[PDB]
Amino acid sequence: PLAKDLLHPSPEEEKRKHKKKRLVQSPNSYFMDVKCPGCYKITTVFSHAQTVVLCVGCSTVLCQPTGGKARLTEGCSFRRKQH
Amino acid sequence: GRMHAPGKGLSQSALPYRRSVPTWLKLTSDDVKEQIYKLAKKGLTPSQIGVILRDSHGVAQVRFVTGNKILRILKSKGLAPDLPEDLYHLIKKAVAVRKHLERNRKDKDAKFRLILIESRIHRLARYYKTKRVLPPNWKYESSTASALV
Amino acid sequence: MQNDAGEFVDLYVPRKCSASNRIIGAKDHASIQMNVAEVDKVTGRFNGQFKTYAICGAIRRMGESDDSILRLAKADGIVSKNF
Amino acid sequence: VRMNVLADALKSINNAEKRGKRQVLIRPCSKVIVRFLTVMMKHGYIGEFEIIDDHRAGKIVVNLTGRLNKCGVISPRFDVQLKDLEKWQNNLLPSRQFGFIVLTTSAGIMDHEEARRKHTGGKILGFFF
Amino acid sequence: AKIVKPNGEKPDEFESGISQALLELEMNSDLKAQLRELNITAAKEIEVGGGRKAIIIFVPVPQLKSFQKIQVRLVRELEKKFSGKHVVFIAQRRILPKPTRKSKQKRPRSRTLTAVHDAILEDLVFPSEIVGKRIRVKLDGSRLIKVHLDKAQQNNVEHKVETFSGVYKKLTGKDVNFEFPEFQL
RNA sequence: GAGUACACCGGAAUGAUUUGGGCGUGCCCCC
RNA sequence: UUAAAGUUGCUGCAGUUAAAAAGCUCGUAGUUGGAUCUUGGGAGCGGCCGUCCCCUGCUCGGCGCCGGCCCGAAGCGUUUACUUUGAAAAAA
Numbered sequence: 001p002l003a004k005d006l007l008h009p010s011p012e013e014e015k016r017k018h019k020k021k022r023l024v025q026s027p028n029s030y031f032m033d034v035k036c037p038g039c040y041k042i043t044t045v046f047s048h049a050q051t052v053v054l055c056v057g058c059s060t061v062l063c064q065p066t067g068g069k070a071r072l073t074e075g076c077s078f079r080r081k082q083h
Numbered sequence: 084g085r086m087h088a089p090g091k092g093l094s095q096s097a098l099p100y101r102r103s104v105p106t107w108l109k110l111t112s113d114d115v116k117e118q119i120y121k122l123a124k125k126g127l128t129p130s131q132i133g134v135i136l137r138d139s140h141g142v143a144q145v146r147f148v149t150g151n152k153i154l155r156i157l158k159s160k161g162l163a164p165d166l167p168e169d170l171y172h173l174i175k176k177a178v179a180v181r182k183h184l185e186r187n188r189k190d191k192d193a194k195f196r197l198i199l200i201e202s203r204i205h206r207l208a209r210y211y212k213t214k215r216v217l218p219p220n221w222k223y224e225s226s227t228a229s230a231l232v
Numbered sequence: 233m234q235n236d237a238g239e240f241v242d243l244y245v246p247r248k249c250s251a252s253n254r255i256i257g258a259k260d261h262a263s264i265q266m267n268v269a270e271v272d273k274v275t276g277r278f279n280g281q282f283k284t285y286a287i288c289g290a291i292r293r294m295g296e297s298d299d300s301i302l303r304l305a306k307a308d309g310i311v312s313k314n315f
Numbered sequence: 316v317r318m319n320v321l322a323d324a325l326k327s328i329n330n331a332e333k334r335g336k337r338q339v340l341i342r343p344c345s346k347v348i349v350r351f352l353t354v355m356m357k358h359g360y361i362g363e364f365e366i367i368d369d370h371r372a373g374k375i376v377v378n379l380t381g382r383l384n385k386c387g388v389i390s391p392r393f394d395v396q397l398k399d400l401e402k403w404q405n406n407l408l409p410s411r412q413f414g415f416i417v418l419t420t421s422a423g424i425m426d427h428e429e430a431r432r433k434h435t436g437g438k439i440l441g442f443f444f
Numbered sequence: 445a446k447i448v449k450p451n452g453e454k455p456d457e458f459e460s461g462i463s464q465a466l467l468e469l470e471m472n473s474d475l476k477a478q479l480r481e482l483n484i485t486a487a488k489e490i491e492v493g494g495g496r497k498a499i500i501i502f503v504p505v506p507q508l509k510s511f512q513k514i515q516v517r518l519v520r521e522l523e524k525k526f527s528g529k530h531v532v533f534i535a536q537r538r539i540l541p542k543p544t545r546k547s548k549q550k551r552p553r554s555r556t557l558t559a560v561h562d563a564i565l566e567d568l569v570f571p572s573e574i575v576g577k578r579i580r581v582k583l584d585g586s587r588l589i590k591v592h593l594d595k596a597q598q599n600n601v602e603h604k605v606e607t608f609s610g611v612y613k614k615l616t617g618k619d620v621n622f623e624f625p626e627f628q629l
Numbered sequence: 630g631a632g633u634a635c636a637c638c639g640g641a642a643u644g645a646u647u648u649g650g651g652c653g654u655g656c657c658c659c660c
Numbered sequence: 661u662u663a664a665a666g667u668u669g670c671u672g673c674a675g676u677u678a679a680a681a682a683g684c685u686c687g688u689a690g691u692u693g694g695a696u697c698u699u700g701g702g703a704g705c706g707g708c709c710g711u712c713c714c715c716u717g718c719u720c721g722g723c724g725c726c727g728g729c730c731c732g733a734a735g736c737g738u739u740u741a742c743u744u745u746g747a748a749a750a751a752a
Contacts, residue, residue: 002252002296003303003337006376007365011627018093024369024576025097031107031141033653040633042653044108044141053138079653082629083105083573083596087686100370102566103573107653195685202686252335253381291335318693345695353585368577372695391692394742406671421743437743474640542698547716547737556697584708617700 030080036060037075044081045070087199104148108141112149115142116156123162129153130168166231170211173204178228249288251300262289266301268310283308320345322388324375325441332383344373347440350424351417352377355386355443358415358426384409388441392419397436400427407442414444448483459487462501469521478514482507485536492610499529500611502536508567515570530607535567561616565589568608571597575625589620595629 006023019028029047039059049063049070063070072078084091118140122132132153136142146152157163164171180197184190204223211217233241246255247265256263266285272278285304291297305311317323320343331339341348344366352375355361360383365376395403395418404427408414416427420435430436447463449455463484470479486502499522503511511533522531537560540551553559566574575592582588593601605622612620 002291002299002335006338006340008625008627014628019097020093023367023374024100025371026099027097031105031143035633035653037633040631043139044653045139046137046141049138050134051138056139077653077657079656081105081107081653081655083101083103083107098370100576101573102370198686205687254335294334316693320694343694353581356581356583357585363583364581366579366581368579396743402671419742434744539698541716544716545738551697553697557699558697561699 032078032080034062034072034076034078036062087203098144102147105143110140110142110148115140115145115148119145119153119156120160120162123157128168129157167211167216170204170207171231173200173207174223174231176200177204177223177225178232181225181228247286249291250286250304251291252288254288254290256286256288260289262292263287268305270310283310317343319388319390321348321351321440322390324348325386325388328377328379328383328386332379332381332386335381336379338376338378341375341377342372344375347419347424348375351440354417354424354426355383360386360443384444386441386443389439392438392440395436395439397431397434400431400436403439409444414442416442446479446483447485449485455486458489459484462487462499465522465525469518469525473517473521475514475517482510482514490611490614492607492614494606494610496607497529498607498611499526499531500615501531501533503533505535505537508533508535530604532568532607532611533570534564537563561618564616565591565612565620568612569593569601569604569622572601575628587618589618590623591620592623592625595624595626598624 009023014022015028019025031044031046033042033044035042036055036059039055041056041059043053043056043062045053045063047069049065051065052061053063053070055062061073062076063072115136118136119132122135123129127135133145136145142148149156151159154163166174177197177200180193180200184193184197187193208217208221208223212219212221235241246257248255249263264287266287268283268285269278270281270283285301287297287300291300302311302315306313306315324341324343327341328339349366352361352364356364360380362378362380364378367374367376389407400416404411404414404416407416417424417440418427418430418436419438419440420430420433421437422433422435424440425433445463445467447459466484470476483504484501485504488500488502489497490500491497515533519531523529538555539557539560540555541547543551572594575594578590578592580588580590608622609620612618
């Protein structure tokens, strides 16, 4: 390609490129919320939780730390959030 | 590339462009700072403090929600130790490697890595001497293992 | 070249590539004075006027000639923008 | 590591112009590079270029028009007087009807042709033709 | 009433009318639980390059963190009070001169020209925030800033972009346009 | 107040009267 | 002895095979070192731009005016490099 359009490329190319090789750098992680059906107390958990997170009040286990994204236990809903 | 390794790595954090406190968390600065002083009184490293905050309490960075980072706060009230945490970890690694070599004589790779980490701690000690953090006459010695572990 | 007398001392004006804005020399045989025809406005016929194009040897040598002829035809308006 | 941002930017422009890329991307940014690209585009070698303002270090998108042959730098930054510029433009330029040398005078980064009129010399950055 | 200028000077009647409107909306609406220390430094009437007029209100810097919670209701109250005029809050920072070598205390970077202009551009468009700033360079050398605005709270900010361009040109001198990218959010 | 579906109110809309809940602001429980 | 010598290469050499990268790593002297701190306009010379003025000062005094204003200033403005002007620099 003699001329790409690096002014405003397509967003599939922006997800195709690296997190730092993009036009403006932006992380590929997000902040998310999670609840347990057998309990109340709700916390907000990072997408790479990096450690075992406890329910706030010592009720249940929520995330298992892995190499990348943390794994949620079954029966727990999750949504992201944005501003 | 790396300072003491042949490989080149490209894997680090990448902050977003947005300069704002997000609206989905409504947590004022002072109660957050109270959580830092409580977690520091529990006896933990500021890196672990930032990890625990962004894990459980949902805050992205301290620098956007307050005017200061963690070590500025712990220096402002005074719970920050005199030994910096990275140099403390390098000291503890040097003590562990030296004890391993003391109980295992015929070894060369461990000795080579010991020379590498002594070079690293010396090159960092020059920086902490010229930025007036450490005392100017403070010299690390291999035999001074039980002073600051 | 101009001159103090106002007389051009040029002996022949060399042509220029329409794609990479480079100059086609005297002994370059990989260059084409391409002619493109436009349609008559009412139904389908041929007027007689020409829409001429040129390209040098290096662009065809690396092979980006189809891209260049698309951009030139889109700039002159032969090919629609949706494409 | 990287010692000269301006050299890497100019030699990236040199590579992408030598093949025939229409527009480029430059990874770091500096003020002196911005003034150099302005004097490039007001002498007409470079079209309407974009620079991007992020919060770490900016990036520069320069569209090219093909008139540029080679643009290079001189390292390290020597000093040149008004009596020594003639030798530098004799042994560094391809001709005398075209090709300019930028240099950091006391009035800022500007070309040698108006520096002869301004009667001010200083350190030297590079050249283009 | 609720106006404390840094200097003991009497300005024109317009900011007096602004303060009278503020006390009227304070005494009529249920805002008395959130307006105790909220002073106003200054206010100015301007006209954009067209057929409309706009209102600048200058506020002090540390007070604006309490002005986060008020600018959902206060802006619509001032818009329904003055129908043909748009209200906008800009913090009052000062620019310090560069410490030239022929010229005392250190100049902090919070008070420099770039930080003041960045803060002014950030506090102009409050309901929608910045996504990215681009800056063109023209043939004449005129640097043209184009800033990308958020998709969130889109419906409030189509009609105010010319007022923001006018106030930034008549306050700083830089031509600024506005755009809405839609391929990221 | 145990806040998952809930029992009390204060503001407030049409001299009188009054509209299912949760905090993850947008989709979840109940009809 | 000099040019030719771009065969001593700062302008301006070479190091896979022709002469030429230490077996490898660390390391004190030495060399080099990322971004960033001031913008813009006006009256006019004219039918946007080539010329020109503007944005650290506070005790002695000589251009005037009706005890106050530019002022001539003894006194002072964190250090360096770079560049232009000026002096001193013997003649042949």
